[PDB]
Amino acid sequence: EQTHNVVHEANGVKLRETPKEFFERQPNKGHIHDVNQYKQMYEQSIKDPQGFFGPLAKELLSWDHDFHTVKSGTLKNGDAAWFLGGELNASYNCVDRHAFANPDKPALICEADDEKDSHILTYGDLLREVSKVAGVLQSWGIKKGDTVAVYLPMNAQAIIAMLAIARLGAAHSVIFAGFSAGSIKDRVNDASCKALITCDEGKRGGRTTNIKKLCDEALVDCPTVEKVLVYKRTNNPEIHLTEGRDYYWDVETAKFPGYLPPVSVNSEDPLFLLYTSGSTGTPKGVVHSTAGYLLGAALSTKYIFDIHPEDILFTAGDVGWITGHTYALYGPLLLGVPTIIFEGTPAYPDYGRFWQIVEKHKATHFYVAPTALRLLRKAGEQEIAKYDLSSLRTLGSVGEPISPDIWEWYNEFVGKNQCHISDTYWQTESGSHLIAPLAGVVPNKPGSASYPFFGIDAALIDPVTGVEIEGNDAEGVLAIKDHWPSMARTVYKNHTKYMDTYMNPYPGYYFTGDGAARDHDGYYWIRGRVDDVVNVSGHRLSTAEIEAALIEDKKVSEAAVVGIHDDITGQAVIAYVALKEGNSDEDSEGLRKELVLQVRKTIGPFAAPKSVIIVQDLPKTRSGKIMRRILRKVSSNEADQLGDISTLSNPQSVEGIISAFGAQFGK
Amino acid sequence: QTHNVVHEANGVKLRETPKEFFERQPNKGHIHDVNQYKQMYEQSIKDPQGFFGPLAKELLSWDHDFHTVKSGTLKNGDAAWFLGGELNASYNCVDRHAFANPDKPALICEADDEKDSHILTYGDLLREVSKVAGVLQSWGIKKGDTVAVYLPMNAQAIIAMLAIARLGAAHSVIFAGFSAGSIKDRVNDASCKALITCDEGKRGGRTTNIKKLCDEALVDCPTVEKVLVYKRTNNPEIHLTEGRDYYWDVETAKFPGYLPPVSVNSEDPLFLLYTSGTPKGVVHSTAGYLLGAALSTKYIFDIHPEDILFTAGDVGWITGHTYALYGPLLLGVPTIIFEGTPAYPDYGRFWQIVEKHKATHFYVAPTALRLLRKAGEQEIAKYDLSSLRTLGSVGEPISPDIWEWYNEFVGKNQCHISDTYWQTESGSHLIAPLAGVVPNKPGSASYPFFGIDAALIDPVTGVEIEGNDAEGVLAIKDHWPSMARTVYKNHTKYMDTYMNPYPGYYFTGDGAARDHDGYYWIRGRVDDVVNVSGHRLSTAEIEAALIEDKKVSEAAVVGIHDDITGQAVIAYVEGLRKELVLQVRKTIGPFAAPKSVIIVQDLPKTRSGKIMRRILRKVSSNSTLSNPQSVEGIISAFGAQF
Amino acid sequence: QTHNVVHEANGVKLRETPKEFFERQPNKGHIHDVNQYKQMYEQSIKDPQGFFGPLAKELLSWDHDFHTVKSGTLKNGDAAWFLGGELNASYNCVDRHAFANPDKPALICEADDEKDSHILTYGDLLREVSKVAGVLQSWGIKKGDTVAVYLPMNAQAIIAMLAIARLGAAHSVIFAGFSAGSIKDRVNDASCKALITCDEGKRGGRTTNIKKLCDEALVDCPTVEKVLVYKRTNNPEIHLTEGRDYYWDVETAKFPGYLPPVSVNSEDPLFLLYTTPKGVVHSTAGYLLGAALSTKYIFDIHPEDILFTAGDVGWITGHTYALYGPLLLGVPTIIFEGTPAYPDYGRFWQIVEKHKATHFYVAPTALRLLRKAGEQEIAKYDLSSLRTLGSVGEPISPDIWEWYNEFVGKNQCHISDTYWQTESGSHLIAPLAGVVPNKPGSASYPFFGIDAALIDPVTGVEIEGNDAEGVLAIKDHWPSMARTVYKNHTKYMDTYMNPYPGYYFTGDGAARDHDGYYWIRGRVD
Ligand SMILES: Nc1ncnc2c1ncn2[C@@H]1O[C@H](COP(=O)(O)OC2CCCC2)[C@@H](O)[C@H]1O
Ligand SMILES: Nc1ncnc2c1ncn2[C@@H]1O[C@H](COP(=O)(O)OC2CCCC2)[C@@H](O)[C@H]1O
Ligand SMILES: Nc1ncnc2c1ncn2[C@@H]1O[C@H](COP(=O)(O)OC2CCCC2)[C@@H](O)[C@H]1O
Ligand SMILES: [Cl-]
Ligand code: NA
Ligand code: NA
């Protein structure tokens, strides 16, 4: 039909064909001829993964040992594997092979917080630095099967460190540089990292950040860390190094030669751990394989973004998140193109920084978070007209609900109505894109991620019956019907948590945690999390971890944290706190600031609640457990719709929550 | 037609394979007849490169190709096969079959009590092996380590062995009936870094103290860093030592159901198997042993993909290693792993298992057959055993009468019987009738198997005996793929035991006879000669000769390695020493005199009164007895006369 | 015709290789004449990929193929060859020849006293190396470890080096004449986990205190967990420390005569050779190719030939031309433990005659010693099996060159004055036997892959044209070039690559005459 009774988003939405200028700027014949070819290849990727992914793995990856079996295992048994028997090395495929072919080709276009510190590393340069750092790590005893923590800003050293660790067959664990000391401690200890790579201080938005200081604080409780390599980012002499543990990047790398042989690893040996927050309270180390993850990165970077050897990719993200892993580092470097590594913020020295960088380097592909787009539309629209952005042809949206208005704003003010937009849906555990419009191929519906990608057999499941929904104009739980090459393989030393989270809720399926709708054309519309996970400014947060942080403050007796819509950050965190012996509304403002600072120092500045609400007690059930549902409805001004609260043990509390929120949220 | 030497063979009619064997056989046999067998056998002896090369590539999956089929000689103790090759044993026994047919049964596990029986598919097995291998890998187990297994004959023993091989470490299976002292000797000789066991066992309805005996042994096993403990009974009173012992279920739950196998070289050790003198760790290679296991299981038993093998043995012995685990799993067929006894809950259990699973092949020790004949004969007829076509006898003297009983009461005179001759150090069958191919003579093992150039040797001269109707020492003229490669960290004992007694041959320690049809009849153990500069001496004859001297109270004679004369004889019992040496020369012969006669007042014996010759051997080469104090005196006494 | 700069070249007649060289040669030479050499040489400079690639596949056996022949630059100190390839040095030196002909002699061992001499076939050598490697493996030695060797020039030293390489570990040979302090400095710089030595040594009849010097050094070498001690004299008064020192014979007896070799990457280190003492590091594939290539073409070695390098494995000379070079090519090599003077000054010649050696390689210092004290001894022995006479690595004056040529060579042999250094791995400039005519005192033409040049020291600019003098420098790296100084790559850059960026600095001055022949003039320091 033409009308939708379920997928209201899709009603009256005209398809948006790729503008003709995209093809004028495309340097070669596209990788896919048209949408009909896409659908034929997609069906083969589902019906015959062996015949589809086999040849692509042999085209796009360089193997030290051939694989004998494309695909093994099932979701239900949590034993997925790809390219069994194969051996390869990630740093060889991202660096060496390109350096041998064209050593002077740019690899890392590094834009520092202050442009005067910007520089460019060629693939040849990259090979020498990666070899030297791997040389240091090898002399420290790092070997295949070890884990190594990285705590670095988004710059050349973070990329070099990751590739040097992979060069030895060890697994890197990158810890976002905005994390607090406690967050560093939790991740380092779960992985039992033998070494850490960090720097003395950072520069962000003109400010100096305390990086090494936080490591020292965390490391007093990290007994497995034997050595730390410290890069002189500011060269501040007041930054202390602990004798016998900490060593300088420049001093140690000067001891080793600019070539070190890469270590062959099996396709299914771990490439990295990436700690993620869930509905648990403790971070879980998501583990990615080597071959399957790398194939997914190359495949999605090539086909969804339409990347060619002549192109230049600017992923405005951070390696602390999966976005930087896959689309700032592995994807582009696998394909041998330059990637722009941006250390600063979109606002410094002014709101034109993104566009100055695109123009400076003639970037052809730009990949950004809707959170930044909303900020730039609000505060920096007047900066765009100052820059020539005609080198661009593909505009990606990293992964957040994008409204049709922002889609149109992005399309008009950045793309001049001449670029293709790729709203990519995916998650840390998918490794690479799951649903996205292929640049130059798939027509767009603004706000829809469009079609599932190669190897992704998406489905909607009825939340009442657990049964897969046939046909279109449907909505339900978003699930995937078979595993795919870049799917996460386990949670580090906690495979049971992995099973309970992803494979057991809907047996036979992978559970994304999202709800979605599928319209009459088969386009998917993401409707957001069904599992109460909260994403603030593109960053996935654990409400339970924030509650635990607030409870550490001994003035607090109970804490409940929920998420709500926010026009800036997508979602915001609202914290409800009951104090032990408080009162004094003159101390309210002050005690609220103290609790926010508590979360800032325990988790990190980016997990701080938007607002802390002081209440006399929280709503609970007969069993005594907190009813967050009530807090959610109140915090979104849906006080009506609470319904029958006679089932609570303390219904009288609800009145207090409605009034406290209406009094305190503003102020 | 008549035999003047091989009396066993006189008047023995050849027993052709019953027609029903071929009716039950699911496909054309692997060999048409005895003429084809002999053509293939001659190639396996004259042209091993051209014979075993193609079979190795057919039957095994390689990570790296081999460049040389065969290297080394018996005389130099440097046998090697498929040099340059790389492979993994668990990949060949599990992964490749799981990818092809994950739902095919792999381990048919019959527990002591049938209520606890279960079946693991090849897909199931891969996941369990991967998870346990993950635990061991997180503990630091890697290529070149040894890991001890002390488990009953059940799925966990099989999983443990394969998980250890998956990492390229070598497993050392310790029979679960062994005492604490027996565990300690084996763990320490191998320096195992980890141990896999269970809390308690179930045998014949009784509860056995498995973990308790391990704890007792481990107080003197400093190399064991961690222990993985399966909850076989889940008895809450079984203590786990904090920081050392961990639960199988708790740890394997942390790891995924796939873990990459580790490639090893063809000649990297697959396992140590300790023999029950001092226990010695028989070391087997990877590629050659696996090829021997698959080849003998395929051709001697006539195993096809449709078949089902029930080896009523134990992984604590080579029988379980080769024909309960590696042989059948290599060929991708199901194998029946039986934890109990032939008598529990009743004397029909063996036959109830065969009927339940429609086993096509049954392999058992004559010792078990004699028990069932004595106490449970009438139970056999109560079960449908018509799925069987091959009945194997594991390896012990089977009389013609037991052969006929086995053939009639179990096989209903419709099955082929395979009396297999082999030993721990041979890895796989040496002499056996190929099922459906070789006609039987009851009590004869028949023809040597592929790659086995068997011979009869005169025990005095070591010279090969030509022609048939002959008897002598059973010896092998060249090494073979699954031949044991060394004794762990004691290669000189290996040489002295197998290669040096009869230079140019492998010494089986057995005597045998060869009849006019070329069939071998195993005649049992020879009496342990010591080779001194080409003269073979009997320690027992020297002891007896010394004892004839009425001034002598006790005498014990032992052999030890010697760099010039090969071995030397030391006798434990200035003028009397000369008289005793002269006594041996005039009684036995001029070249039989001991290198030295040492005067001692006493030396160790056991409760049975048998002399602990091991003690003297170690003393002459520089508490467990019934008279421990005795040992002390000789530390000086050996230093006194020698 | 005249030289205004290269005064050494004036009035020097070319010395064609004598006629008898080709009569004694067992097969058609590997290169026909100087013109064919210059065609091959130019390809090795212009197109190293197409020249060395095929040669690497011809002369070495690979466990994994390489994907790239050559990588890196001198200026960046990141040279690499045969990238991606895997191989094992002991497989190429032992296993593959043992399989083909196990009874062919490998180590012709002449002891300090001839009564103790013996010969190991390739089959023999595989068993002894397997057993020693089995000992080291049981001790935990693995790829990436270093093992120190403090042994005289005898079978045990060759077996130890090969057994360490068999496991993919790196051997660090310490000349048996070094003091305890010299042992300590090397052992600690390399952090060796094990040491292989002997109880005592025999040199010129005298007994040397070998284990005793080790024991003194080991008090300050905490990384050494175990020591393997060969009973060279079997002196019972030599102390072994309980729990650290073990006997070679006692431990090897426990292990079998075959052990699988361990694959290493082309650019994994094969050995550290210390020259304070700096550890020169040599790759595996590049070094081995250089060793086989120079031994084959400069010395004209054929499968039937027999090489006598009168050197010591404590120096690079024994590494490349007593062990790796000849064993790679599958020919016998003579390992001489003694001195040219004991029991008499006819020892070298009695050995050449005894084994019908075809090639002899020695330093001029020994030549000067024999000319002074043992010239009459030469005539007593039959040296008619020789055809190539080598000069290891010192300035050979025309007088010595003429004496060497007449009295040892009977004016029927070719002489190869080889110029090279520890850091070059193998010969840099040398006359190819049966190909390059000689000028006494001149090393002649650069070898394959060696693009030699002269640099004006004052200006640092490369000197065009001939009749020139200046600093000797190489313009691109070569397969056997040392890759670093152990854990001190900055000292490596400062010494070799930074003085003249874009060049490899030899530290020597040289002259190039109108024919292109090079005359080594000595250190610039
Ligand atoms: N195109 C999209 N449109 C709407 N919502 C989206 C879209 N992509 C992702 N999400 C939500 O983000 C979660 C994943 O979070 P995370 O693992 O941090 O990955 C982030 C960071 C990099 C990729 C996203 C999904 O499960 C969804 O809820
Ligand atoms: N078919 C046979 N007929 C008569 N005797 C036989 C036969 N097979 C073996 N033996 C004797 O058992 C020793 C080997 O014992 P073992 O290594 O424990 O192996 C056990 C477990 C597997 C085989 C037996 C032989 O050397 C012989 O003396
Ligand atoms: N044919 C030669 N003519 C004149 N001088 C020569 C010649 N060969 C080398 N040198 C000098 O020896 C140094 C190298 O010494 P070393 O590294 O010990 O290697 C030497 C000793 C062991 C092997 C060679 C060169 O740099 C030069 O100074
Ligand atoms: Cl006597
Ligand atoms: Na390989
Ligand atoms: Na390999």
Buried b (16+ CB within 10 A) or exposed e, B50-72: ebbbebbeebbebbbebebbbbb
Cα gap A264→C437, rounded to integer Å: 48
The pair of three-digit structure tokens given for residue B229, joined into one six-digit string = 């403990």
Does A398 contact ligand 1 (Cβ within 6 A)? yes
Residues B442, B447, B449, B454: is their CA dihedral positive or negative? positive
To 5 degrees, how large is the angle CA A218–CA A221–CA A225? Answer: 85
Measure Cα distances from A605 to A180, A597, A599, B207 in Å: 8, 8, 8, 60
Determine if ligand 3 sits within 6 Å of the CB of residue C417: yes
Contacts of B381 (CB under 8 A, 6+ apart): B409
Do residue C490 and residue A255 have CB atoms under 8 angstroms apart?
yes
Cβ–Cβ < 8 Å for A144, A263:
yes
**C267 and A259 Cβ atoms separated by less than 8 Å:** yes
Which of the 8 DSSP states describes residue B496? I
User: Tokens at residue B35, please?
Assistant: 């003429």
Q: At what angle do helices B122-138 and B155-166 cross, to 10 degrees?
A: 60
Residue A656 CA to residue B94 CA, distance in Å, equals: 63
Shortest CA distance to A421 belongs to which of A380, A393, A456?
A: A393
Please answer whether residues C486 and C272 qualify as being in contact, where contact means their C-beta atoms are separated by less than 8 angstroms.
yes
Nearest one of B167, B251, B165, B235 to B200, comparing CA atoms: B235
Q: How far apart are CA A430 and CA A440, in angstroms?
A: 24
Q: Tokens for B249?
A: 């279920």
- Are residues A596 and A549 in contact, defined by beta-carbon separation less than 8 angstroms? no
- The CATH number covering residue A191 comes to 3.40.50.12780
Ordered DSSP codes for B516-558: TTS-EEEEEE---EEEETTEEEEHHHHHHHHHHSTT----EEE
How far is ligand 2, taken at its centre, from the CA of residue B12, in Å?
23
Q: Which domain holds residue A95?
A: 8-513
- Which residue, chain included where needed, has tokens 């040492």? B598
d(CA A379, CA A655): 39
Q: How many CB atoms lie within 10 A of CB B503?
A: 13
Query: What are B571's strand-pairing partners?
Result: B557, B597
Pairing of strands A69-72, A81-84: antiparallel
DSSP assignment letter at C387: -
Tell how far the Cα of A267 is from the centroid of ligand 5, in angstroms: 14
Q: What is the DSSP letter of A497?
A: H
Q: Are C388 and C299 in contact (CB under 8 A)?
A: yes
- Judge whether A181 lies within some domain: yes
Cα A185 from Cα A219, distance rounded (Å): 7
DSSP letter for each residue of C194-221: EEEEESEEEETTEEEEHHHHHHHHHTT-
E strands present in B425-573: 454-457, 470-476, 486-487, 506-514, 520-525, 529-532, 535-538, 556-562, 566-572
Spatial separation of the C-alpha atoms in residues A68 and A310, rounded to whole Å: 33
In a domain, B234, yes or no: yes
Distance CA B40, CA B48 (A): 10
Phi-psi region for residue B566, left (φ > 0), alpha (ψ -120 to 50) or beta? left
Provide the β-strand partners of residue B454.
Answer: B476
List the beta bridge partners of residue B283.
B272, B486
CA C348, chain centre distance (Å): 19
Tell whether A487 is covered by a domain.
yes
Q: Is B565 on the interface with A (CB under 8 A)?
A: no
Q: Which pair of tokens denotes residue A580?
A: 């032990």
Exp. method: X-ray
Mutation target for B interface from C65, C141, C258: give the one with most B CBs within 10 A: C258
- A509, A513, A506: which is closest to A534 by C-alpha? A513
DSSP B143-164: TT-EEEEE--SSHHHHHHHHHH
Q: How many angstroms separate the Cα of C70 from the Cα of each of B77, C48, C64, C80?
A: 43, 8, 16, 6
Confirm whether A548 is domain-assigned.
no
Taking each helix axis as running N to C, give the angle between helix B180-190 and helix B210-218, from 0 to 180 degrees, rounded to the nearest 10. 50
Return the closest-CA partner of residue A406 out of A440, A439, A368, A438: A368
Q: If we measure between CA atoms, which residue out of A500, A573, A494 comes closest to residue A282?
A: A494
Please state, in angstroms and rounded to a whole number, the distance separating the CA atoms of residues A557 and B628: 71
Q: Cβ contacts of residue A520 below 8 Å, gap of 6+?
A: A1, A2, A4, A7, A10, A472, A473
Burial class (CB in 10 A: 0-12, 13-18, 19+), C294: buried
Task: Check A80 against B258: CB less than 8 A apart.
Answer: yes
Q: Please list, in sequence order, all residues whose beta carbon lies within 8 angstroms of the beta carbon of residue B265, skipping any fewer than 6 positions away.
A: B84, B85, B86, B286, C260
Show the beta-strand stretches assigned E in A481-532: 490-491, 510-518, 524-529
C-alpha to C-alpha distance for A658 and A619, rounded to whole angstroms: 11
Residue A408: other Cβ atoms inside 10 A: 15
DSSP of B255-319 = S-S--PPPPEETTS--EEEE------EEEE-SHHHHHHHHHHHHHTTT--TT--EEE---TTSHH
Residue minimizing CA distance to atom 15 of ligand 1: A427
Q: Check: CB of residue C136 under 8 Å from CB of residue C167.
A: yes
Query: Letter for the amino acid at C362?
Result: V
Strand order in B470-476's β-sheet? B454-457, B470-476, B506-514, B520-525
User: Is residue B454 within 8 Å of B431, Cβ to Cβ?
Assistant: yes
φ/ψ (deg, to 5) at C434: 70, 15
Q: Is the dihedral of CA B59, B63, B68, B72 positive or negative?
A: negative
Under 8 Å between Cβ of A410 and A371: no
**Are the C-beta atoms of residues A199 and A228 closer than 8 Å to each other?**
no
Q: How far is A91 from chain B (nearest CA, A)?
A: 20
In a domain, B542, yes or no: no
Q: Read off the DSSP letter of residue C462.
A: B
- Identify any residues that bridge with B70 across adjacent strands, giving them in sequence order: B81
CA-based nearest distance C226→chain B, Å = 17
CB crowding A313-332: b at 16 or more within 10 Å, else e: bbbbbbbbbbbbbbbbbbbb
Helix C155-166 / helix C122-138 crossing angle, nearest 10 deg? 60
Integer Cα distance of C319 and C315 in angstroms: 7
The experimental resolution of this structure, in angstroms, equals 2.3
The neighbours of chain B, by the rule of 3 or more Cβ pairs under 8 Å, are: A, C
The answer to whether B78 contacts C127, with C-beta atoms less than 8 Å apart, is: yes
User: Is C138 close to B489, i.e. CB distance below 8 A?
Assistant: yes
- CB of A449 closer than 6 A to ligand 1? yes
**How many Å apart are CA A316 and CA C376, to the nearest integer?**
85
Provide the 10 A C-beta neighbour count for residue C493: 21
Q: What is the DSSP letter of C114?
A: G
Which residues make Cβ contacts (< 8 Å) with residue C447, sequence separation at least 6? Answer: C41, C294, C297, C298, C426, C427, C428, C429, C430
Nearest to C362 by CA among C427, C310, C422: C310
Q: Which of B405, B339, B335 is nearest to B363 (CA)?
A: B335
HEC profile of C405-438? HHHHCCCCCEEEECECCHHHCCCCECCCCCCCCE
DSSP letter at C322? I
Ligand 4 centroid to residue B591 C-alpha, Å: 10
CB within 8 Å: B78 and C257: yes
**Whole-number Å distance between alpha carbons of B3 and C129:** 51
Q: What distance in Å separates the CA atoms of residue C426 and residue B191, rounded to the nearest whole number?
A: 44
**Sign of the dihedral through C-alpha B336, B338, B342, B346:** negative
Distance CA A640, CA A585 (A): 27
Q: If residue B628 lies in a helix (H) or strand (E), which one and from where to where? A: none
Most ligand 3 atoms within 8 A of CB, residue of C153, C445, C520, C525 to mutate: C520
Query: Which of B321, B363, B510, B519 has most ligand 2 atoms within 8 Å of CB, for mutation?
Result: B510
The DSSP letter of residue C447 is P
Gaps (C–N > 2.5 Å) in chain B: which residues precede them?
276, 573, 622
**Which one of the ligands is nearest to B425 CA?**
2
Number of structural domains in chain A? 1
DSSP A89-139: -HHIIIIIHHHHH-TTSEEEEEE-SSGGG-EEEEHHHHHHHHHHHHHHHHH
Query: ∠ CA(A350), CA(A356), CA(A357), 5° rounding?
Result: 115
Residues 6 or more apart in contact with residue A344 via CB below 8 angstroms = A111, A112, A113, A114, A203, A204, A205, A353
The order of strands in the sheet holding B335-338 is B118-121, B105-110, B335-338, B309-311, B361-364, B390-393, B416-419
Domain contains A593: no
State the Cα–Cα distance between residues B193 and B170, nearest whole angstrom: 11
Residue type, B47: D
Q: Round to whole Å and give the CA distance between B519 and B513.
A: 8
Give the side-chain half-sphere CA count within 13 A for A628.
16
Q: What kind and span of H or E run contains C181?
A: helix C180-190
CA of C363 to the centre of ligand 3 (A): 10
How far is Cα A349 from Cα A347, in angstroms, rounded to an integer? 6
Which atom of ligand 3 lies closest to the CA of C396? 3
- State the maximum Cα–Cα separation within chain C, in Å, rounded to a whole number: 72
> How many residues appear in chain B?
642
Q: Which residues contact C313 (CB under 8 A, 6 or more apart)?
A: C149, C151, C153, C157, C158, C161, C173, C319, C322, C323
Residue pair A88/A264 in contact (Cβ under 8 Å)? The answer is: yes
Strands A510-518 and A524-529 turn out to be: antiparallel
Dig out the tokens for B36 from the structure. 């084809």
Residue C22 domain flag: yes
CB contact under 8 A, C260 and B76: no
Alpha helices in A486-607 (DSSP H): 495-498, 543-552, 588-602
Closest CA to A576 of A542, A616, A622: A616
SS3 A570: strand
Side-chain-side CA neighbours of residue B582 (13 Å): 6
User: In one letter, which amino acid is B22?
Assistant: F
Task: Specify the DSSP class assigned to residue B92.
Answer: I
Distances (CA, A) of A161 to A83, A219, B446, C487: 26, 19, 67, 20
CA distance B448 to B465: 16
The reply to whether ligand 3 has any atom less than 6 angstroms from the CB of C421 is yes
| C-alpha of C462 from chain center | 30
Q: Are strands C206-209 and B596-598 parallel, antiparallel or unpaired?
A: unpaired
Instruction: Return the bridge partners of B273, or none.
Output: B282
Q: Rounded to the nearest whole angstrom, what is the distance from the C-alpha of residue A482 to the centroid of ligand 1?
A: 20
- Parallel/antiparallel/unpaired status of strands A539-541 and A534-536: antiparallel
User: B452-458 long-range contacts, Cβ below 8 Å, gap at least 24?
Assistant: B452/B476, B452/B480, B453/B45, B453/B477, B453/B478, B454/B430, B454/B520, B455/B505, B456/B512, B456/B513, B456/B514, B457/B502, B457/B505
Cα–Cα distance for residue pair B107/B120, rounded to 1 Å: 5
Orientation of helix A35-47 relative to helix A49-60, angle to 10°:
110
The minimum-distance atom of ligand 2 relative to the CA of B398 is 3
Q: Give the C-alpha separation, A561 to A609, whole Å.
A: 8
Single-letter amino acid, residue B630: S
Instruction: Supply φ then ψ for residue C385, to 5 degrees.
Output: -80, -25
Residue B13 included in any domain: yes
**Alpha carbons A608 and A602: distance in angstroms, whole number:** 10
A565 contacts A401 by C-beta, under 8 angstroms: no
